[PDB]
Design an enzyme around this catalytic site. Structure first.
Site, PDB file in Angstrom:
ATOM      1  N   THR A   1      -7.054   0.928   8.129  1.00  0.00           N
ATOM      2  CA  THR A   1      -5.940   1.631   7.431  1.00  0.00           C
ATOM      3  C   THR A   1      -5.889   3.103   7.839  1.00  0.00           C
ATOM      4  OG1 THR A   1      -6.259   0.144   5.530  1.00  0.00           O
ATOM      5  CG2 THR A   1      -4.832   2.060   5.198  1.00  0.00           C
ATOM      6  N   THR A   2      -4.735   3.527   8.350  1.00  0.00           N
ATOM      7  CA  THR A   2      -4.512   4.922   8.721  1.00  0.00           C
ATOM      8  C   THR A   2      -3.143   5.389   8.231  1.00  0.00           C
ATOM      9  OG1 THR A   2      -5.749   4.432  10.760  1.00  0.00           O
ATOM     10  CG2 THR A   2      -4.767   6.627  10.562  1.00  0.00           C
ATOM     11  N   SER A 130      -9.461   4.551   6.486  1.00  0.00           N
ATOM     12  CA  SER A 130     -10.666   4.329   7.287  1.00  0.00           C
ATOM     13  C   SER A 130     -10.515   4.800   8.732  1.00  0.00           C
ATOM     14  CB  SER A 130     -11.060   2.851   7.256  1.00  0.00           C
ATOM     15  OG  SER A 130     -10.020   2.038   7.771  1.00  0.00           O
ATOM     16  N   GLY A 131      -9.311   4.650   9.281  1.00  0.00           N
ATOM     17  CA  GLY A 131      -9.033   5.021  10.666  1.00  0.00           C
ATOM     18  C   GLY A 131      -8.766   6.500  10.886  1.00  0.00           C
ATOM     19  N   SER A 170      -7.818  -0.677  11.232  1.00  0.00           N
ATOM     20  CA  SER A 170      -6.468  -0.228  11.564  1.00  0.00           C
ATOM     21  C   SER A 170      -5.915  -0.980  12.770  1.00  0.00           C
ATOM     22  CB  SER A 170      -6.451   1.277  11.837  1.00  0.00           C
ATOM     23  OG  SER A 170      -6.884   2.006  10.703  1.00  0.00           O
TER      24      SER A 170
END
Lengths: 202, 201, 213, 220, 204, 123, 196, 216, 196, 202
Positions: A1-2, A130-131, A170
């Site tokens: 996820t970004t 996270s990314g 991501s």
């Protein structure tokens, strides 16, 4: 996820990936992480999928009633404060990292970042998920003060492409959103439309 | 599991059931719990099925070499000591056994209780297993040293029977053995269901 | 941390007769919720009078069979004799117990013929305890096959039955019936059933299809 | 458990298996997994079997109460929000994985609802134990705006893939086709697996069981 | 295991125009047997029975609380309860205790009043009903009972043939279970008569 | 460790090291023992004690157990090793077998101890 | 540790319990009574936790006596056994459960002698003979052997004596004195204590 | 190996008419990060056999130098004897089980592909020592995604051509990129034939993202 | 659980031990002897683990008898107590430790009567009177009260009887029989067993 | 901790930070992580300070003795293989992330990576440590194929400056090393000599 949101003169530019994972399996490779709250107010979702969606719908309900009662277009600070009050009060129960970015006729383009703690701060640019941890070096080096709308679209698209390249959580597709006085315009950069960066080979 | 052994004027009575369980499910109801060590020595099976079978067979091996070297039969006290010494080296490792070694010795009728923990005690009556507590009840109330040979069979056979009735892990068939001076003899292999009809009439 | 064991399923069945011995098992090999292969027989022949069946952890099953095959030759070279069914059953007991504190997650059933000519079936646990019996079921569906064997082969709970001796025709039909029933309820049992027949003549094999789901 | 849903040109096709297991043993060979919500919306179920039934029945009860007050056909988004807000409130303790699909005045809408409360709007979704096998079929053969019979073939192959490969799924394939004017609830669409009929009869003869006591009580 | 504490097994079977229900009679704590004569099958309305297997407390508690709701239903409504209605009543009773359930698996067997149709079902501890046309089993030896029923059961069976089938399916499955036994009671339900038999079983 | 072969076979077919050890026992003091009806008695000759020496230390009669005793001849330094090794075996027998050691068993142990030293390397 | 035993006859109920109240390794009391008088013909044998024994047994005792005063007639042994089960079953899943294994003995005017076995989880079971504690493991087998449905009261005490002597022989815990009481058509009768 | 560090995901394998094809993506995942996107996980053992491995990459390189030397040592003799596809598979079963019993296992999952004496071989080896033979093989998340696709085609058509086997793999590799989070769009295709073992360079599967617009 | 007691006088040593070999909840033996003969005037009383008791006691027993044969004379009670202490202390930090609580009693030709207390950790302490087990908690106080350094063996057995009667009254574990032995100038003497 | 090694036509360009922390406290802000093994071979240390230093001294002893026996200039592949054998054999005992880069007359400029597992791979550029995670986006976008010596010096300096900016475990001084046929030349970038990057403020 970004997730990413960059502020310019006329408004804001938002960008997010589309990969949502439950362990190592991708449940949805084309998730829409840019949730509309009002006419010009958008948010970026990261963390628990059940938590981020439930809070976003709650703020839409809270600001929706707030906008009609005051009979004025809602402020970005007002929408971010409603996210702040929910993420801080239930910080031990919710796992969410929300970046709220929008436009109001009083202040203009605004980017607010609300992480897991529940704090709220205004920034020129904001990255989460996270990314995002893989592009802290790139964004700090490439960011120029006083970038135009079209430059901010390129700035967000390049940073997300580099993040999706390295991060396993991501990936998928790039979803962009531009908000100004005129309204909200969204575009999706597909598989071949993604900015390609060369792979290190001997 | 219910294994019992007691000594009296005429010899040593060995009695055991045949139920073997893997938790709640019964694996077998025909296991030979009275382990035939020698034509003159007998053992029992309680706790670990392989632990009782392997080590007593190693004892059966050791007793035969003793007979070839010394030209004489091994004593019950020595046979009990050998098994107690071997299993003691693996104390607190995972072995589980509760055996009774029976046989006629130069001193007379012999009975020894050997554990995986390292116990070795000689007495007149013993009972090992999950249903051992029920076996002690009916056995002690009808026990006598001057008891007849036929009266000794009826006591041990029923003692297992009463234990199988209460204990869930005990059942199958009651196996009975009599130990005499010349050697042990196989008495009876009565089924619990067949005995139920016998005691009712 | 790390687990050296894995449940692979599979159920092995054996019935002893007056002159025959049947060893049968399913060909399904699985792990967790996924199937590895649909063709993996658990029955394996050792000599002209002995057939072994292994169930449980396949890693141990594959290795242990190679130990037995190596020990079969060692006995053959030293004694100039083919190893009997009773001798193999006694040998496997020591091999399984040699790994007492680190046991094979294995349920062995040996089916063959003794020195006289009668059918012999031996049952084994992970540690090495063994006994001779007329019939035995071991594996995942062992609790499903045994009650039917107690009733039809052992003639238990039935009041007035003449006690008919076991024939190969009747025993083969009984093996096929129980595995059909096992495939309906047990998820580890299915695909295809392989039956090995041990007689005075030799070893013969037969394959019967099952539920593929 | 293998449940799936797809969106085609006219409406929605939903698929499910019939195997219900207690641990690693099959308890029910024929089990209904496609559940009734409204005369236009149906919902497939996975996870905890008791949690799936009671949550479905409560939403179906609430929407019938909702449709009679409004006087018009309920929406899929209404069914989605009711399931979304309830499962979130219990923090995933109600283990109900639901594939929601129906036809509205707006059009066909498909949803995948997780026990924790997360919802996803997609053209095709898979959930349950054999969802991995079912998604692979969709990721290979799915195409936008396909025919009704072509979409029925797509889902049936996806459920079958979960049936043969996954141990949690088995037996029959159930399909539910909902369109703008037609609703086809095909209970037994395909039966790929069946019992090999018993050639050896084990019928117990009259008087083979020993009886100790007998008592007969007459009725009206 | 909580279910394996007291043991027990309950079986139900379908025939032509008759339903049969069988259960073991053992009451015991873990390994020690206590009572030979323990009731597990309870009457619900002349031609409808429920068999409960699991924890001995919850077997008695559910049966009493279901009878509490049964009588109120039969007084409010001038009719005898339907098998489908009772199935949903048990399902509702067990689900009320979702996060603290009764450790028992109910099995309902009986004929439908006025319509003479057979009915069988089994439920979970939290109350999940499933209907079958062949058999339903619950208890500690569930796997043992499945193996017998899959081989012995036939589509259309008369009361006498159904009795011999359910009796042999219980006895042999029970004899392979340590925590179940000490006699098997069978209730054969017909439109005209109820036949109750206590079978000769192993007492070990 | 010393692994040289001490006792070896010879052209004629004799083990010289064993034969020379039999010459050492012949050079030692005389020891005679007879078996009676109720008592068994052994005695040693040629004490040749200088009278200026304590005769409690040079006693050739040594009891191995409560019911077993022995008298030796030859190298008194070698016998003291064997006596002590046999005395341990009398107690080691009791730990394994609760019965006391018999005369035949203890003699077989001493003989096997002497036999192993005529075939082992370096001994 | 505590011990209970009950034997039912054709027209009587015989019950016995040890008089030992023990803590850690010491015997504090020598003459402890574990029988509770519920009615004129009903006794309760309560055994279990330190505080749960006295609190639960007396709560049911006073409630049974409350029924007596409000109606005029006493509760039947069957109704009293189902009442004490209901209170234990309802408290089982509550915050404060009672860990008590009890035995109910009573004589009815119409149905006759009755004995009830009950677990700490509240599982009621009707039995001709029952026993609680670790001593039950040694005595129940003797009760399975010599018991007859038509046993005389002089033979029942003799049967009881055979079981109590087993506790002196095999049972590791010292239990010298036992309280013996008989319930019949006349009511509760106190019998001589069997001591060793 | 107690804890796997740099790991490789799914490795596919299917045998066709006169040969076997194995494909594995060029990626070494460090937890969740795609650390190395240009590493070979497929090796050529000899002229008739090849190997593709999943899991810890450092353990694969150890098995690469051992099997590499074992072929060299055999080729030194030149006595007309070579290791068969079954011989390498049997050795690997003994190698992985021996270290499993020592409580220090190689964190690997292998797919053996070979063609000798007109027979196509496909073998599977676990980190514990579980081995079997299958017409189609898939490791890791491939067993859940790609294997269901491989089984249905071989059920309809048991014997495939080299072209049909390749297009099936490319279809399976596309699905793995869609659903496996730790996969990469750069894979090698290795093929056994009568000519020998041939491994092709960097290859990418074409992906479609048309489901991006059809949500509303 | 097992019990030991030792009372040492001016010219004698009085020692007693229970005859109960208990497992879980049952008494397996009735005449179990927990006293080992080391020499003609030395006794060893071992109490503790199931296997460690017999194995350790006999090992020291055969080694003391080995000293007797190798030299001609027996070990002194002080030397025997220090020898058994060395073997337990060395094995304490080894792979297999013996968990045994022993009580050594001996008479010397020069020194006289002796009694030694010893823990499972191997701690030797000379005491005029000592006791082992849970029963020690009830008997040591009585041995602190009525004990005199010049007590006669006529009064010592009476003092021993006072302690064993406390075990019949307060001690929860059933110990009916006790084996009594006296070590003096003439050696070890078997006295009548005190039974209840 | 952030370590870097970039390969060019002549040889290699190295770079490492100067921060070593024992929790949240800096034990040494002057740590030299560029360890010399031979005349042209260097390694970059990351992870446990006790583990990495012990292996680096052991390889120097092994390669030093090896180079004399063959009487030939040591290869970079040979030096990296000695690091590989120690990091793989004792992978459950050592915490090391070594990047080995140098020059030899046979191959030239070479960069090898030995991560936590114990594997070995040749790369055009390599990054390791805790702070390397933040600059994955920057390095992938800025890297050009066929960069000169002077360009690689700036490329390493910029990437390290961005890593120390974001990472708490990384900071202090940039230490650079350039190796070619001529030899080894090292330079130290101080406080104000650090690559300047703007901080985004409203």
């Amino acid at each position: 996820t970004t997730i990413m949101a960059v502020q310019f003169n006329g408004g804001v530019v938002l960008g997010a990936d589309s990969r949502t994972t439950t362990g190592s399996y991708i449940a949805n490779r084309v998730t829409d992480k840019l949730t509309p709250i009002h006419d010009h107010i958008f948010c970026c979702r990261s963390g628990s999928a059940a938590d981020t969606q439930a809070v976003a719908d709650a703020v839409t309900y809270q600001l929706g009633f707030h906008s009609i009662e005051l009979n004025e277009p809602p402020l970005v600070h007002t929408a971010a404060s409603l996210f702040k009050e929910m993420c801080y009060r239930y910080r031990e129960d919710l796992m969410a990292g929300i970046i709220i970015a929008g436009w109001d006729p009083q202040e203009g383009g605004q980017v607010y970042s609300v992480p897991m703690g529940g704090m709220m701060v205004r920034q020129s640019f904001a990255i989460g998920g996270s990314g995002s941890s893989y592009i802290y070096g790139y964004v700090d080096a490439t960011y120029r003060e006083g970038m135009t709308k079209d430059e901010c679209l390129q700035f967000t698209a390049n940073a997300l492409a580099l993040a999706m390249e390295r991060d396993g959580s991501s990936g998928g597709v790039i979803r962009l959103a531009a908000i100004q006085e005129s309204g909200v315009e969204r575009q999706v950069l597909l598989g071949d439309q993604i900015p390609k960066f060369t792979i290190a080979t001997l | 599991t219910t294994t019992l052994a007691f000594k009296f004027l005429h010899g040593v009575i060995v009695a055991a059931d045949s139920r073997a369980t893997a938790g709640a499910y019964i694996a077998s109801q025909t296991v030979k719990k009275v382990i035939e060590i020698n034509p003159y020595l007998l053992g029992t099976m309680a706790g670990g099925a392989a632990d009782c079978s392997f080590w007593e067979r190693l004892l059966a091996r050791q007793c035969r070499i003793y007979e070839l070297r010394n030209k004489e039969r091994i004593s019950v006290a020595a046979a009990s000591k050998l098994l107690a010494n071997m299993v003691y080296q693996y104390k607190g490792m995972g072995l589980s056994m509760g055996t009774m070694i029976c046989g006629w010795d130069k001193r007379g009728p012999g009975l020894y209780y050997v554990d995986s923990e390292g116990n070795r005690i000689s007495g007149t009556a013993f009972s090992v297993g999950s249903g051992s507590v029920y076996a002690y009840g009916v056995m002690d109330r009808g026990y006598s040293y001057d008891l007849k040979v036929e009266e000794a069979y009826d006591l041990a056979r029923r003692a297992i029977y009463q234990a199988t009735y209460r204990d869930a892990y005990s059942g199958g068939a009651v196996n009975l053995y009599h130990v005499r001076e010349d050697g042990w003899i196989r008495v009876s292999s009565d089924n619990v269901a067949d005995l139920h009809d016998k005691y009712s009439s | 941390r790390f687990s050296p064991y894995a449940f692979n399923g599979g159920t092995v069945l054996a019935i002893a007769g007056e002159d025959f011995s049947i060893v049968a098992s399913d060909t399904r090999l699985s792990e967790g919720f996924s199937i590895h292969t649909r063709d993996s027989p658990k029955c394996y022949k050792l000599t002209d009078k002995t057939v072994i069946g292994c169930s449980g952890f396949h890693g141990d099953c594959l290795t242990l069979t190679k130990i037995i095959e190596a020990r079969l030759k060692m006995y053959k070279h030293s004694n100039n004799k083919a190893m009997t069914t009773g001798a193999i059953a006694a040998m496997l007991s020591t091999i399984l117990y040699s790994r007492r504190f680190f046991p094979y997650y294995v349920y062995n059933i040996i089916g063959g013929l003794d020195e006289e000519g009668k059918g012999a079936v031996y049952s084994f646990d992970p540690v090495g305890s063994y006994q001779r019996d007329s019939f035995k079921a071991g594996g995942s569906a062992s609790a499903m096959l045994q009650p039917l064997l107690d009733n039809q082969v052992g003639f238990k709970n039935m009041q007035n039955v003449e006690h008919v001796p076991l024939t190969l025709d009747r025993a083969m039909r009984l093996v096929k019936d129980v595995f059909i029933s096992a495939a309906e309820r047990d998820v580890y049992t299915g695909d295809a059933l392989r039956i090995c027949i041990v007689t005075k003549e030799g070893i013969r094999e037969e394959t019967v299809p099952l539920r593929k789901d | 458990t293998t449940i799936a849903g797809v969106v085609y040109k006219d409406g929605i096709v939903l698929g499910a298996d019939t195997r219900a297991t207690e641990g690693m043993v099959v308890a029910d060979k024929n089990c209904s997994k496609i559940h009734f919500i409204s005369p236009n919306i149906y919902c497939c179920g996975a996870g905890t079997a008791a949690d799936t039934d009671m949550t479905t029945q409560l939403i179906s009860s609430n929407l019938e109460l909702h449709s009679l007050t409004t006087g018009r056909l309920p929406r899929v988004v209404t069914a989605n929000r009711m399931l979304k807000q309830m499962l979130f409130r219990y923090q995933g303790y109600i283990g109900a994985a639901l594939v929601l699909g129906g036809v509205d005045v707006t059009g066909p809408h498909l949803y995948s609802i997780y026990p924790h409360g997360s919802t996803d709007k997609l053209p095709y979704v898979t959930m349950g134990s054999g969802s991995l096998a079912a998604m692979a079929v969709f990721e290979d053969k799915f195409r936008p705006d396909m025919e009704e019979e072509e979409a029925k073939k797509l889902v049936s192959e996806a459920i079958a893939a979960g049936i043969f490969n996954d141990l949690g799924s088995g037996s029959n394939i159930d399909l539910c086709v909902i369109s703008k004017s037609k609703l086809d609830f095909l209970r037994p669409f395909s039966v790929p697996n069946k019992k090999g009929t018993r050639l050896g009869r084990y019928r117990c003869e009259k008087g083979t069981t020993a009886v100790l006591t007998e008592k007969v009580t007459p009725l009206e | 295991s909580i279910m394996s504490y007291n043991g027990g097994a309950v079986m139900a079977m379908k025939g032509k125009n008759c339903v049969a229900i069988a259960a073991d009679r053992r009451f015991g704590i873990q390994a020690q047997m206590v009572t030979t004569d323990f009731q597990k099958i309870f009457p619900m309305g002349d031609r409808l029975y429920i068999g409960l297997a699991g924890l001995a407390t919850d077997v008695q508690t559910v049966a009493q609380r279901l009878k509490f709701r049964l009588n109120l239903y039969e007084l409010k409504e001038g009719r005898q309860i339907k098998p489908y209605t009772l199935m949903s009543m048990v399902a509702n009773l067990l689900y009320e205790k979702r996060f603290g359930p009764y450790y028992t698996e109910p099995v309902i067997a009986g004929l439908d009043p006025k319509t003479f149709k057979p009915f069988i079902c089994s439920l979970d501890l939290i109350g999940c009903p499933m209907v079958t046309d062949d058999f339903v089993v619950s208890g500690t030896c569930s796997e043992q009972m499945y193996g017998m029923c899959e081989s012995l059961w036939e589509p259309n069976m008369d009361p006498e043939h159904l009795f011999e089938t359910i009796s042999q399916a219980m006895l042999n499955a029970v004899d392979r279970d340590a925590v179940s036994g000490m006699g098997v009671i069978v209730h054969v339900i017909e439109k005209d008569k109820i036949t109750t038999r206590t079978l000769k079983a192993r007492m070990d | 460790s010393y692994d040289r072969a001490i006792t070896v076979f010879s052209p004629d077919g004799h083990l010289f090291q064993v034969e020379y050890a039999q010459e050492a026992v012949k050079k030692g003091s005389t020891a005679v023992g007879v078996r009676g009806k109720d008592i068994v008695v052994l005695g040693v000759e040629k004490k040749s004690v200088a009278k200026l020496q304590d005769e409690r230390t040079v006693r050739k009669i040594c009891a191995l157990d409560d019911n077993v005793c022995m008298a030796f001849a030859g190298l008194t330094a070698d016998a003291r090793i064997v006596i002590n090794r046999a005395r341990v075996e009398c107690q080691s027998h009791r730990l394994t077998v609760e019965d006391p050691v018999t005369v035949e068993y203890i003699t077989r142990y001493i003989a096997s101890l002497k036999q192993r030293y005529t075939q082992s390397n370096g001994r | 540790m505590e011990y209970l035993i009950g034997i039912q006859g054709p027209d009587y109920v015989l019950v016995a319990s040890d008089r030992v109240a023990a803590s850690n390794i010491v015997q504090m009391k020598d003459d402890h009574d574990k029988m509770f008088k519920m009615s004129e013909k009903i006794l309760l044998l309560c055994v279990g936790e330190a505080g749960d024994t006295v609190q639960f047994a007396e709560y049911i005792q006073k409630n049974v006596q409350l029924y007596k005063m409000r109606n005029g007639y006493e509760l039947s042994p069957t109704a009293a056994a189902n009442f004490t089960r209901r209170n234990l079953a309802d408290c089982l899943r509550s915050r404060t459960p009672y860990h008590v294994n009890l035995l109910l003995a009573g004589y009815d005017e119409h149905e006759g002698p009755a004995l009830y076995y009950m677990d700490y989880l509240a599982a009621l079971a009707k039995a001709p003979f029952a026993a609680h504690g670790y001593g039950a493991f040694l005595t129940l087998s003797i009760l399975d052997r010599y018991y007859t449905p038509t046993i005389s009261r002089e033979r029942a005490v003799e049967l009881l004596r055979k079981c109590l002597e087993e506790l002196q022989k095999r049972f590791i815990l010292n239990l010298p004195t036992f309280s013996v009481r008989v319930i019949d058509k006349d009511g509760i009768h106190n019998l001589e204590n069997i001591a060793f | 190996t107690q804890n796997p560090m740099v790991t490789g995901t799914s490795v596919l394998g299917v045998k066709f008419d006169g040969g076997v094809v194995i494909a594995a993506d060029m990626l070494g995942s460090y937890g969740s990060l795609a650390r190395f996107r240009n590493i070979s996980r497929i090796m050529r053992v000899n002229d008739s056999t090849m190997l593709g491995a999943s899991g810890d990459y450092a353990d694969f390189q150890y098995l690469k130098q051992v099997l590499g030397q074992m072929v060299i040592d055999e080729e030194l003799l030149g006595d007309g004897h070579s290791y068969s596809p079954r011989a390498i598979h049997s050795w690997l079963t003994r190698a992985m089980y021996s270290r499993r019993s020592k409580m220090n296992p190689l964190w690997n999952t292998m797919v053996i592909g070979g063609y000798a004496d007109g027979e196509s071989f496909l073998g599977y080896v676990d980190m514990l020592g579980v081995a079997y033979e299958a017409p189609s093989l898939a490791t890791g998340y491939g067993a859940y995604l790609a294997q269901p696709l491989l089984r249905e085609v071989l059920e309809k058509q048991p014997v495939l051509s080299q072209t049909e086997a390749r297009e099936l793999v490319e279809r399976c590799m596309r699905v793995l990129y869609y659903r496996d989070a730790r996969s990469y769009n750069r894979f090698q295709i290795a093929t056994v034939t009568e000519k020998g073992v041939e491994i092709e360079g960097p290859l990418s599967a074409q992906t479609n993202w048309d489901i991006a617009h059809m949500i509303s």
